[PDB]
PDB file of C-alpha atoms and ligand atoms in Angstrom:
ATOM      1  CA  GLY U  87       0.000   0.000   0.000  1.00  0.00           C
ATOM      2  CA  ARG U  88       3.091   2.179  -0.023  1.00  0.00           C
ATOM      3  CA  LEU U  89       2.059   3.283  -3.465  1.00  0.00           C
ATOM      4  CA  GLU U  90       3.678   6.715  -3.510  1.00  0.00           C
ATOM      5  CA  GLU U  91       7.050   5.090  -2.812  1.00  0.00           C
ATOM      6  CA  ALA U  92       6.417   2.442  -5.485  1.00  0.00           C
ATOM      7  CA  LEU U  93       5.786   5.172  -8.059  1.00  0.00           C
ATOM      8  CA  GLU U  94       9.018   6.991  -7.145  1.00  0.00           C
ATOM      9  CA  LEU U  95      10.963   3.834  -7.731  1.00  0.00           C
ATOM     10  CA  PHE U  96       9.123   3.402 -11.040  1.00  0.00           C
ATOM     11  CA  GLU U  97      10.231   6.831 -12.262  1.00  0.00           C
ATOM     12  CA  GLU U  98      13.777   6.238 -10.982  1.00  0.00           C
ATOM     13  CA  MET U  99      14.301   3.039 -12.927  1.00  0.00           C
ATOM     14  CA  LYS U 100      13.024   4.852 -16.015  1.00  0.00           C
ATOM     15  CA  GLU U 101      15.421   7.786 -15.564  1.00  0.00           C
ATOM     16  CA  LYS U 102      18.220   5.235 -15.203  1.00  0.00           C
ATOM     17  CA  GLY U 103      17.149   3.623 -18.448  1.00  0.00           C
ATOM     18  CA  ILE U 104      16.171   0.335 -16.867  1.00  0.00           C
ATOM     19  CA  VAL U 105      13.177  -0.699 -18.928  1.00  0.00           C
ATOM     20  CA  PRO U 106      10.010  -1.525 -16.962  1.00  0.00           C
ATOM     21  CA  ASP U 107       8.124  -4.702 -17.868  1.00  0.00           C
ATOM     22  CA  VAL U 108       4.661  -6.259 -17.560  1.00  0.00           C
ATOM     23  CA  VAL U 109       5.122  -7.245 -13.898  1.00  0.00           C
ATOM     24  CA  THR U 110       6.186  -3.696 -13.060  1.00  0.00           C
ATOM     25  CA  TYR U 111       3.179  -2.153 -14.882  1.00  0.00           C
ATOM     26  CA  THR U 112       0.778  -4.731 -13.537  1.00  0.00           C
ATOM     27  CA  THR U 113       1.865  -4.367  -9.910  1.00  0.00           C
ATOM     28  CA  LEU U 114       1.406  -0.589 -10.157  1.00  0.00           C
ATOM     29  CA  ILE U 115      -1.881  -0.641 -12.075  1.00  0.00           C
ATOM     30  CA  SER U 116      -3.162  -3.231  -9.641  1.00  0.00           C
ATOM     31  CA  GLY U 117      -2.047  -1.135  -6.660  1.00  0.00           C
ATOM     32  CA  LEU U 118      -3.395   2.114  -8.068  1.00  0.00           C
ATOM     33  CA  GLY U 119      -6.572   0.111  -8.706  1.00  0.00           C
ATOM     34  CA  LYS U 120      -7.092  -1.074  -5.114  1.00  0.00           C
ATOM     35  CA  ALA U 121      -6.380   2.425  -3.884  1.00  0.00           C
ATOM     36  CA  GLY U 122      -9.180   3.676  -6.143  1.00  0.00           C
ATOM     37  CA  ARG U 123      -6.867   5.884  -8.239  1.00  0.00           C
ATOM     38  CA  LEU U 124      -8.408   4.589 -11.454  1.00  0.00           C
ATOM     39  CA  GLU U 125      -7.497   7.423 -13.786  1.00  0.00           C
ATOM     40  CA  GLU U 126      -3.790   7.077 -12.929  1.00  0.00           C
ATOM     41  CA  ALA U 127      -4.111   3.335 -13.483  1.00  0.00           C
ATOM     42  CA  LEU U 128      -5.542   3.984 -16.949  1.00  0.00           C
ATOM     43  CA  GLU U 129      -2.810   6.487 -17.782  1.00  0.00           C
ATOM     44  CA  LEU U 130      -0.223   3.829 -16.925  1.00  0.00           C
ATOM     45  CA  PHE U 131      -2.106   1.393 -19.122  1.00  0.00           C
ATOM     46  CA  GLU U 132      -1.860   3.801 -22.073  1.00  0.00           C
ATOM     47  CA  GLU U 133       1.858   4.312 -21.503  1.00  0.00           C
ATOM     48  CA  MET U 134       2.550   0.610 -21.210  1.00  0.00           C
ATOM     49  CA  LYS U 135       0.899   0.119 -24.630  1.00  0.00           C
ATOM     50  CA  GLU U 136       2.905   2.975 -26.180  1.00  0.00           C
ATOM     51  CA  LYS U 137       6.109   1.249 -25.103  1.00  0.00           C
ATOM     52  CA  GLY U 138       5.150  -2.056 -26.641  1.00  0.00           C
ATOM     53  CA  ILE U 139       4.808  -3.859 -23.314  1.00  0.00           C
ATOM     54  CA  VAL U 140       1.915  -6.244 -23.920  1.00  0.00           C
ATOM     55  CA  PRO U 141      -0.801  -6.266 -21.249  1.00  0.00           C
ATOM     56  CA  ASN U 142      -2.427  -9.481 -20.070  1.00  0.00           C
ATOM     57  CA  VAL U 143      -5.584 -10.801 -18.473  1.00  0.00           C
ATOM     58  CA  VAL U 144      -4.643  -9.533 -15.009  1.00  0.00           C
ATOM     59  CA  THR U 145      -4.132  -5.984 -16.262  1.00  0.00           C
ATOM     60  CA  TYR U 146      -7.459  -6.002 -18.108  1.00  0.00           C
ATOM     61  CA  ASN U 147      -9.334  -7.522 -15.174  1.00  0.00           C
ATOM     62  CA  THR U 148      -8.133  -4.849 -12.797  1.00  0.00           C
ATOM     63  CA  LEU U 149      -9.134  -1.990 -15.059  1.00  0.00           C
ATOM     64  CA  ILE U 150     -12.448  -3.491 -16.096  1.00  0.00           C
ATOM     65  CA  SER U 151     -13.249  -4.155 -12.448  1.00  0.00           C
ATOM     66  CA  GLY U 152     -12.318  -0.603 -11.432  1.00  0.00           C
ATOM     67  CA  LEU U 153     -14.332   0.878 -14.289  1.00  0.00           C
ATOM     68  CA  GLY U 154     -17.256  -1.373 -13.470  1.00  0.00           C
ATOM     69  CA  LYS U 155     -17.282  -0.441  -9.810  1.00  0.00           C
ATOM     70  CA  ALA U 156     -17.355   3.205 -10.943  1.00  0.00           C
ATOM     71  CA  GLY U 157     -20.368   2.898 -13.255  1.00  0.00           C
ATOM     72  CA  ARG U 158     -18.138   3.566 -16.251  1.00  0.00           C
ATOM     73  CA  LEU U 159     -19.614   0.683 -18.240  1.00  0.00           C
ATOM     74  CA  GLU U 160     -19.002   2.041 -21.722  1.00  0.00           C
ATOM     75  CA  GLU U 161     -15.269   2.305 -21.098  1.00  0.00           C
ATOM     76  CA  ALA U 162     -15.239  -1.097 -19.378  1.00  0.00           C
ATOM     77  CA  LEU U 163     -16.938  -2.572 -22.476  1.00  0.00           C
ATOM     78  CA  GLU U 164     -14.406  -0.845 -24.739  1.00  0.00           C
ATOM     79  CA  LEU U 165     -11.581  -2.538 -22.857  1.00  0.00           C
ATOM     80  CA  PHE U 166     -13.427  -5.875 -22.936  1.00  0.00           C
ATOM     81  CA  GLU U 167     -13.641  -5.768 -26.725  1.00  0.00           C
ATOM     82  CA  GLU U 168     -10.014  -4.649 -26.951  1.00  0.00           C
ATOM     83  CA  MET U 169      -8.594  -7.537 -24.963  1.00  0.00           C
ATOM     84  CA  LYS U 170     -10.453  -9.889 -27.289  1.00  0.00           C
ATOM     85  CA  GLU U 171      -9.033  -8.175 -30.399  1.00  0.00           C
ATOM     86  CA  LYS U 172      -5.605  -8.872 -28.946  1.00  0.00           C
ATOM     87  CA  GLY U 173      -6.296 -12.527 -28.218  1.00  0.00           C
ATOM     88  CA  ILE U 174      -6.171 -12.028 -24.480  1.00  0.00           C
ATOM     89  CA  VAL U 175      -8.850 -14.464 -23.349  1.00  0.00           C
ATOM     90  CA  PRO U 176     -11.341 -13.051 -20.799  1.00  0.00           C
ATOM     91  CA  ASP U 177     -12.005 -15.028 -17.635  1.00  0.00           C
ATOM     92  CA  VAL U 178     -14.835 -15.628 -15.176  1.00  0.00           C
ATOM     93  CA  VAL U 179     -13.897 -12.502 -13.217  1.00  0.00           C
ATOM     94  CA  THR U 180     -14.096 -10.351 -16.349  1.00  0.00           C
ATOM     95  CA  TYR U 181     -17.571 -11.591 -17.311  1.00  0.00           C
ATOM     96  CA  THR U 182     -18.827 -11.563 -13.721  1.00  0.00           C
ATOM     97  CA  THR U 183     -17.822  -7.908 -13.389  1.00  0.00           C
ATOM     98  CA  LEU U 184     -19.462  -6.802 -16.636  1.00  0.00           C
ATOM     99  CA  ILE U 185     -22.668  -8.738 -16.000  1.00  0.00           C
ATOM    100  CA  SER U 186     -22.739  -7.204 -12.517  1.00  0.00           C
ATOM    101  CA  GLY U 187     -22.096  -3.722 -13.884  1.00  0.00           C
ATOM    102  CA  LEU U 188     -24.639  -4.083 -16.670  1.00  0.00           C
ATOM    103  CA  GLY U 189     -27.099  -5.519 -14.170  1.00  0.00           C
ATOM    104  CA  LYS U 190     -26.629  -2.706 -11.665  1.00  0.00           C
ATOM    105  CA  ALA U 191     -27.178  -0.316 -14.574  1.00  0.00           C
ATOM    106  CA  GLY U 192     -30.383  -2.158 -15.459  1.00  0.00           C
ATOM    107  CA  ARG U 193     -28.976  -3.042 -18.868  1.00  0.00           C
ATOM    108  CA  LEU U 194     -30.345  -6.531 -18.323  1.00  0.00           C
ATOM    109  CA  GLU U 195     -30.708  -7.777 -21.903  1.00  0.00           C
ATOM    110  CA  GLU U 196     -27.014  -6.997 -22.524  1.00  0.00           C
ATOM    111  CA  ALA U 197     -26.070  -8.837 -19.317  1.00  0.00           C
ATOM    112  CA  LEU U 198     -27.883 -11.899 -20.641  1.00  0.00           C
ATOM    113  CA  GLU U 199     -26.096 -11.696 -23.977  1.00  0.00           C
ATOM    114  CA  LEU U 200     -22.715 -11.712 -22.249  1.00  0.00           C
ATOM    115  CA  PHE U 201     -23.920 -14.691 -20.261  1.00  0.00           C
ATOM    116  CA  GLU U 202     -24.787 -16.579 -23.471  1.00  0.00           C
ATOM    117  CA  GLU U 203     -21.391 -15.600 -24.852  1.00  0.00           C
ATOM    118  CA  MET U 204     -19.320 -16.730 -21.851  1.00  0.00           C
ATOM    119  CA  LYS U 205     -20.909 -20.195 -22.015  1.00  0.00           C
ATOM    120  CA  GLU U 206     -20.097 -20.465 -25.730  1.00  0.00           C
ATOM    121  CA  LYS U 207     -16.470 -19.787 -24.930  1.00  0.00           C
ATOM    122  CA  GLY U 208     -16.523 -22.323 -22.105  1.00  0.00           C
ATOM    123  CA  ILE U 209     -16.051 -19.891 -19.203  1.00  0.00           C
ATOM    124  CA  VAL U 210     -18.021 -21.466 -16.338  1.00  0.00           C
ATOM    125  CA  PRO U 211     -20.581 -19.235 -14.568  1.00  0.00           C
ATOM    126  CA  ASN U 212     -20.645 -19.203 -10.781  1.00  0.00           C
ATOM    127  CA  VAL U 213     -23.205 -18.278  -8.141  1.00  0.00           C
ATOM    128  CA  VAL U 214     -22.541 -14.515  -8.374  1.00  0.00           C
ATOM    129  CA  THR U 215     -23.351 -14.559 -12.079  1.00  0.00           C
ATOM    130  CA  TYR U 216     -26.538 -16.584 -11.637  1.00  0.00           C
ATOM    131  CA  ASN U 217     -27.557 -14.400  -8.703  1.00  0.00           C
ATOM    132  CA  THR U 218     -27.118 -11.181 -10.683  1.00  0.00           C
ATOM    133  CA  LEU U 219     -29.164 -12.427 -13.626  1.00  0.00           C
ATOM    134  CA  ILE U 220     -31.853 -14.034 -11.504  1.00  0.00           C
ATOM    135  CA  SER U 221     -32.203 -10.924  -9.402  1.00  0.00           C
ATOM    136  CA  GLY U 222     -32.384  -8.705 -12.496  1.00  0.00           C
ATOM    137  CA  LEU U 223     -34.916 -10.993 -14.190  1.00  0.00           C
ATOM    138  CA  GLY U 224     -37.023 -11.225 -11.024  1.00  0.00           C
ATOM    139  CA  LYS U 225     -37.116  -7.495 -10.447  1.00  0.00           C
ATOM    140  CA  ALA U 226     -38.406  -7.101 -14.010  1.00  0.00           C
ATOM    141  CA  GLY U 227     -41.334  -9.488 -13.846  1.00  0.00           C
ATOM    142  CA  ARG U 228     -39.544 -12.035 -16.006  1.00  0.00           C
ATOM    143  CA  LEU U 229     -40.188 -14.941 -13.680  1.00  0.00           C
ATOM    144  CA  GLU U 230     -40.173 -17.809 -16.166  1.00  0.00           C
ATOM    145  CA  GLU U 231     -36.678 -16.977 -17.370  1.00  0.00           C
ATOM    146  CA  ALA U 232     -35.537 -16.516 -13.781  1.00  0.00           C
ATOM    147  CA  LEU U 233     -36.850 -20.022 -13.089  1.00  0.00           C
ATOM    148  CA  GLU U 234     -35.098 -21.384 -16.198  1.00  0.00           C
ATOM    149  CA  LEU U 235     -31.819 -19.977 -14.931  1.00  0.00           C
ATOM    150  CA  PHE U 236     -32.531 -21.355 -11.473  1.00  0.00           C
ATOM    151  CA  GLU U 237     -33.088 -24.819 -12.919  1.00  0.00           C
ATOM    152  CA  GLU U 238     -29.934 -24.470 -15.021  1.00  0.00           C
ATOM    153  CA  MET U 239     -27.576 -23.580 -12.182  1.00  0.00           C
ATOM    154  CA  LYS U 240     -28.827 -26.568 -10.162  1.00  0.00           C
ATOM    155  CA  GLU U 241     -28.168 -28.854 -13.133  1.00  0.00           C
ATOM    156  CA  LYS U 242     -24.608 -27.527 -13.335  1.00  0.00           C
ATOM    157  CA  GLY U 243     -24.103 -28.114  -9.630  1.00  0.00           C
ATOM    158  CA  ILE U 244     -23.724 -24.415  -8.938  1.00  0.00           C
ATOM    159  CA  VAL U 245     -25.475 -24.453  -5.580  1.00  0.00           C
ATOM    160  CA  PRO U 246     -27.962 -21.594  -5.013  1.00  0.00           C
ATOM    161  CA  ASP U 247     -27.883 -19.421  -1.912  1.00  0.00           C
ATOM    162  CA  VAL U 248     -30.324 -17.511   0.268  1.00  0.00           C
ATOM    163  CA  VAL U 249     -30.433 -14.461  -1.995  1.00  0.00           C
ATOM    164  CA  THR U 250     -31.225 -16.731  -4.945  1.00  0.00           C
ATOM    165  CA  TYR U 251     -34.209 -18.252  -3.164  1.00  0.00           C
ATOM    166  CA  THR U 252     -35.270 -14.989  -1.545  1.00  0.00           C
ATOM    167  CA  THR U 253     -35.458 -13.324  -4.986  1.00  0.00           C
ATOM    168  CA  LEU U 254     -37.447 -16.118  -6.604  1.00  0.00           C
ATOM    169  CA  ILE U 255     -39.740 -16.562  -3.611  1.00  0.00           C
ATOM    170  CA  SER U 256     -40.324 -12.823  -3.612  1.00  0.00           C
ATOM    171  CA  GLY U 257     -41.119 -12.887  -7.346  1.00  0.00           C
ATOM    172  CA  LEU U 258     -43.407 -15.909  -7.117  1.00  0.00           C
ATOM    173  CA  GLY U 259     -45.018 -14.300  -4.078  1.00  0.00           C
ATOM    174  CA  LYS U 260     -46.106 -11.016  -5.588  1.00  0.00           C
ATOM    175  CA  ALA U 261     -46.783 -12.395  -9.091  1.00  0.00           C
TER     176      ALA U 261
HETATM  177 CA1  LIG R   1     -10.968   0.084 -29.012  1.00  0.00          CA
END
């Protein structure tokens, strides 16, 4: 968490002409991320790309997660499509974040399309994903799809939790 010291060292090595690499950039972006200094993280990301250092799934996850937590879904989505253009395969954390973000933003139909997509690519959904979708579907009256998803997660052995049930029972209750 001694991030200000980390950044000084970063500059220093650059002044000395010791070339930073992906672990350097990732550690810093990741740190800046956790500290909520997202814009500085993104500036570093730009610079890294300008220098030809190739980012990887950890870098993208951090930024997408930070952007998602901040409601900045359009930029998150831009990064998501970029990492795919570069052959950097998204992971469960990536999808879970976006589906969350899109859910929170009530962009439910888009959340469901990402869900469809992640299964095509063989990324396995987990309880947070199913919860987000089932909650979103339930809040919107769409109870039969909610129940389809509920049945599906049980088939896959993704075990539902209290919020899952509470949502569906709520929906079935006042509907
Ligand atoms: Ca782009």
